[PDB]
Amino acid sequence: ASVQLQNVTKAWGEVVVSKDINLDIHEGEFVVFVGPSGCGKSTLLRMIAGLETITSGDLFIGEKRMNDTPPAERGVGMVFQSYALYPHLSVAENMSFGLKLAGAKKEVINQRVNQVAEVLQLAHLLDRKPKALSGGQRQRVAIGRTLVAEPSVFLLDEPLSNLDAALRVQMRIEISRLHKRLGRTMIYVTHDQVEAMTLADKIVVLDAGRVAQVGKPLELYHYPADRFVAGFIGSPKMNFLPVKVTATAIDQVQVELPMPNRQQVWLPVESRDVQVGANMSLGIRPEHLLPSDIADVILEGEVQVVEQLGNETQIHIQIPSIRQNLVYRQNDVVLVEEGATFAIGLPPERCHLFREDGTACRRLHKEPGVA
Amino acid sequence: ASVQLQNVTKAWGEVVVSKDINLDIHEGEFVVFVGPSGCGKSTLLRMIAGLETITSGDLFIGEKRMNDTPPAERGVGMVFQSYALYPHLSVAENMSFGLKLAGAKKEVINQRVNQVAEVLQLAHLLDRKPKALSGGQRQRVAIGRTLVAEPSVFLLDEPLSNLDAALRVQMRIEISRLHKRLGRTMIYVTHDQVEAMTLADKIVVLDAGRVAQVGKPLELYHYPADRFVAGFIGSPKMNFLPVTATAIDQVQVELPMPNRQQVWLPVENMSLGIRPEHLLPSDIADVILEGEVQVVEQLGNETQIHIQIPSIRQNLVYRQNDVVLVEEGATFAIGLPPERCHLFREDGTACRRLHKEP
């Protein structure tokens, strides 16, 4: 079903953990919730499920106001963050519990429990009680319980957090295959940036009770609305450099680099509400920084940290007149020493620019992938 | 303190869950355990803790046997996988619990509690009970509790699993900062590959109870010992192909694809292994490999492309930097580098790569 939240507010006394949240999740839409730890991702899910009350505002599921409806009558299933498995019942019994409450046949139950358990690699653990399982196994049971139930609305609170990287990819596809088979609404919380990009039709970013930005995966990566979103999507984080406006054209802004040489550069970015002389913040991603060989803007400094990841190498560079280190990603293993001199190119069309209040000057460079 | 295990075996009645494992961890060493879900990482960690019994074998912490020793006398702390927080005590009281036991000092306690809570960004949550906290917030309290106690050996069980990407980065750094300042042994269980590579002095790969390999982060990446280690280290998974003539210092095999090409490999029914990151663009390399695109994943920083090769049932994953405009059902060709290839035997063991990596 469709799930729509209008002016939803949640308060624990004077502490307001959800403020004026407005969301419109249409039927069959896969929506990923991301945000900093303790921003209110579960609180939202719990209000949707009916496990937490709403202070003010309205919630609609299938165009019916659900504020005062008991959890059982919501058509909502949830994969709890704490798993919340029935510790007195086995894996099989946990996954078959919802069907036993209905007048479901034993063979009907067994057919669709074994099927779901075999895709989660739980076929050998069917008789086990939750105490006799690992943390990643308990989590697969929690998912398996909700998968069997096949609700109108799927809620998954960080459902892969405790799995190995290889199994995490195997589960991602099986979840994605389900959504394409059933065409049902799925609201999915994750901290894994890869999950979010691969699974979502639409991503919601939260920041301490508020929705920061809603958009397509690439739409948030390429075009963040503000400084917060820009630093949250994509990991490693975006580099930020304090710059000064020197000149404006309608479709570009010229900024001065904080270095003693005060190098000037034009960026394809809106000049709307941008005054000459004002202090902006320049954003560039570690992936986007170029090798110095051929580059018009050169940033040189002293290497502070080298992280060897195998497939790539991350270099952290201390550049004078900027307090924060610059992070850069080279493909393959590149032999660099700590303390060595390193230079990187800075591409103008791939730069983001943010005002003093934090809002982004809309990037006007048409980046491939965004329709 | 140093920690070493000798022929350690663990069983639940009859079923072996840790088979004859040997580990030597020196003092001031940062060791990380990795392995598939339910392989025995926590079990291993818990046996070191003393919370689980050891069936057969020897455990030494600081040059003295610890098998018979109770957990409280081992000089060890632990960040639990499931947090295991004290529900009747606040965040401040949860963190200042170990210090309150081993000679309580009013000033030292509050001083060390405030500083550890500051770096875990828990300062505004000191008066809260665990029930009034988020999952990630409880995880950080679990971490704080062990960091405040400052034991001889740190045991951390997936201590970042429920934290956002940006906070995970910040936590990694503070764990390393603490590791270099104290110079104490740390055993760290994680599923995050980036954490594994950047923290560890030594990585241990576990496989259904037994140790598959032990070596340097970059050593396990470039030179795995067997098929399993190669498939587990580095995500996305290394691609595998079911591959006639052998020389003194190199081995040649034939591709199963309809054209039947022959290529020499600088190594010692085989299985050829190639990583998605090591595959080259079409026009560059000599060994072209063509097929149909199945899945395209746009990750922002890069594009990952699944390619179905004729006569090869298993798909081929390719990684390329930046945003690439490719759609399903379209043709795609990739280069196959000979020197970057791995080779695996019928039983599973790897033929040692002789090509030296930087």
Partner: protein, 288 residues
Amino acid sequence: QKARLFITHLLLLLFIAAIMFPLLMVVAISLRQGNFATGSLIPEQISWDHWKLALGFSVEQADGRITPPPFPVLLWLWNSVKVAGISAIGIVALSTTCAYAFARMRFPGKATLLKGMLIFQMFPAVLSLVALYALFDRLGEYIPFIGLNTHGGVIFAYLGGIALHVWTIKGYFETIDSSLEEAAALDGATPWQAFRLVLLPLSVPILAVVFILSFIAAITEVPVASLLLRDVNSYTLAVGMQQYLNPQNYLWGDFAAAAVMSALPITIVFLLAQRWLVNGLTAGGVKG
């Protein structure tokens, strides 16, 4: 250090011996010839007569004549098991359902009613028997099954003593993580289904406690049962053994045998309940 087990084993043994001593004097009284409240731990003159008559045997005496058992002590005991058994099952069932609503549901005056229950039960039961007799006398002519001189009436009379058991079960219910029943409700479980299929199997230790505490209460209870029961063959053991007590002297030997006998069903039930007194029932369910 396993000197802690030895010192505990030693201190328990000394504690057991100390607390057993008074009870061993009762056993001594039950096996002593004649009726004497005092004497040696091992009676100088041992007699089986008191246990013979309690177990239903006839006793031949010094002059030759045979004394038949004056009282059906074993039937009395069986009457005690029945009354205490059903009574306990009833108190468990009534206090558990009540606690569930107090621990999981919300309704106006929830906090007032719970504290009212604790207060009104802590009233001195001094003139209560006057009121109780008047109630069951009136009740008897409409529902004879639960009137005067019936086991039903006695059982019915105890079902009012639940206040504390409600508090005890409510307290235990509150230790169990709510997300288990939340998960259940999301699986489509009614509040009853969540109660029966999730909460109760995890609450099984405290249900045994309440059953035990009620079974003891009913076995040892005298005033109310004595007030309601008239027929000798319907007497519980506690009521029946009052016949051994007279204004000037007690038949100690027979009273003691009755006392030791009444402790037996307590022991049996206590042993059987242990299967429900288990650790770590909620283990592996909730991360935290």
